Amino acid sequence: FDGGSRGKGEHFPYEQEIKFFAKVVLPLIDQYFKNHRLYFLSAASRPLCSGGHASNKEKEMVTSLFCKLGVLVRHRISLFGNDATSIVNCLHILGQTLDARTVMKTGLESVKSALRAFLDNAAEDLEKTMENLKQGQFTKGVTQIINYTTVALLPMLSSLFEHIGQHQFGEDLILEDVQVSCYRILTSLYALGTSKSIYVERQRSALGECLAAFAGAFPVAFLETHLDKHNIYSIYNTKSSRERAALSLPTNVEDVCPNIPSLEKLMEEIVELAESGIRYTQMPHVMEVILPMLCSYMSRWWEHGPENNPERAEMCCTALNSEHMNTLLGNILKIIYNNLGIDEGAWMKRLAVFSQPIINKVKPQLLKTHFLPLMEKLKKKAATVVSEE
């Protein structure tokens, strides 16, 4: 129908078939997997204590169906009759239904390659969106791919990344060349977030959630590259020098992601922004994307921090300190105090739920003398739309 569509035959000989597909197949794919999402997830790992978990073959063919649905949705949001939302829902729920560990350790190579190519395809699509958005603001194929990205690709990548991160399937799902694709993805999302394009300002937040989920999912300490040598799943350690030079890779852990600053650096910019206390329109980029970015990253690497595992300390991938989390949360709370009087807004409703994990990991003796100030800064406003918790 791609070749039949520009012809007179807009009515297609299998229009009944496509109507049946859109009306029935997609909603049942939603409903069945929503009802039994735990069944496919269960792999004798203790979920589904009743018994009868999904087979490994069933899991792998579910994963293959996910990739095929992504292939279908790729750049066809307009071709689908406003049901692209339904396909987005299908992909989002299937992402939760996926089990990556089982299919990695035991899976069919064709499905493995389909899934790898899906991740790659998302990567070059996002890279193309960057390159066109940067080279030209002028408005069409590029508009179509931009809309495709913003509508489907970013939400589905966000959902998949959040799923993989909260099930901890990254460290075994993403090892070879899929790590490279996701380095491309991280550079892409970060550059898009820090872009000052009025066009990306509209869809800015969705980039925030997507890149935050990616930060939570990515299993290599990308902010701190000084001692990534301790990382055993590191692409540099696993791939080695011969293959690293063979692949189009900068061969330097610092050079693999130039634009993104280090964790320490972003801490000094975060604190100086904190003393600055500027209005939201002055620098929305940092405090709407990078703050969730750092929150997610520290929430992800805290347990890998040496203080979490005192034995085998200083051999850890990256150093996480309670002092650093308290400094960060202090930055949030006090910039929230500065900007709360200034017209408020929904970004702080978002930031509250992004910063929920760190305010959970923080100690309760640290909760006193810290949230009590947050309480009084709540009560300073007679009527407060933005209820910071």
Swiss-Prot record:
Modification after translation, per record: Channel activity is modulated by phosphorylation. Phosphorylation is increased in failing heart, leading to calcium leaks and increased cytoplasmic Ca(2+) levels.
Location in the cell: Sarcoplasmic reticulum membrane
Tissue expression per record: Detected in heart muscle (at protein level). Heart muscle, brain (cerebellum and hippocampus) and placenta.
Residue numbers of Phosphoserine PTMs: 5
Highest taxon of source: Eukaryota
Regulation: induction: By TGFB1.
Self-association and partners: Homotetramer. Can also form heterotetramers with RYR1 and RYR3. Interacts with FKBP1A and FKBP1B; these interactions may stabilize the channel in its closed state and prevent Ca(2+) leaks. Interacts with CALM and S100A1; these interactions regulate channel activity. Identified in a complex composed of RYR2, FKBP1B, PKA catalytic subunit, PRKAR2A, AKAP6, and the protein phosphatases PP2A and PP1. Interacts directly with FKBP1B, PKA, PP1 and PP2A. Interacts with SELENON. In cardiac muscles, identified in a complex, composed of FSD2, CMYA5 and RYR2.
Entry's free-text remark on domains: The calcium release channel activity resides in the C-terminal region while the remaining part of the protein resides in the cytoplasm.
Family: Belongs to the ryanodine receptor (TC 1.A.3.1) family. RYR2 subfamily.
Record's function text: Cytosolic calcium-activated calcium channel that mediates the release of Ca(2+) from the sarcoplasmic reticulum into the cytosol and thereby plays a key role in triggering cardiac muscle contraction. Aberrant channel activation can lead to cardiac arrhythmia. In cardiac myocytes, calcium release is triggered by increased Ca(2+) cytosolic levels due to activation of the L-type calcium channel CACNA1C. The calcium channel activity is modulated by formation of heterotetramers with RYR3. Required for cellular calcium ion homeostasis. Required for embryonic heart development.
Disease tied to this entry: Ventricular tachycardia, catecholaminergic polymorphic, 1, with or without atrial dysfunction and/or dilated cardiomyopathy: An arrhythmogenic disorder characterized by stress-induced, bidirectional ventricular tachycardia that may degenerate into cardiac arrest and cause sudden death. Patients present with recurrent syncope, seizures, or sudden death after physical activity or emotional stress. CPVT1 inheritance is autosomal dominant.
Protein known as: Ryanodine receptor 2
Organism: Homo sapiens (Human)
Lineage of source species: Eukaryota, Metazoa, Chordata, Craniata, Vertebrata
Span within the parent record: 2943 to 3337 of 4967
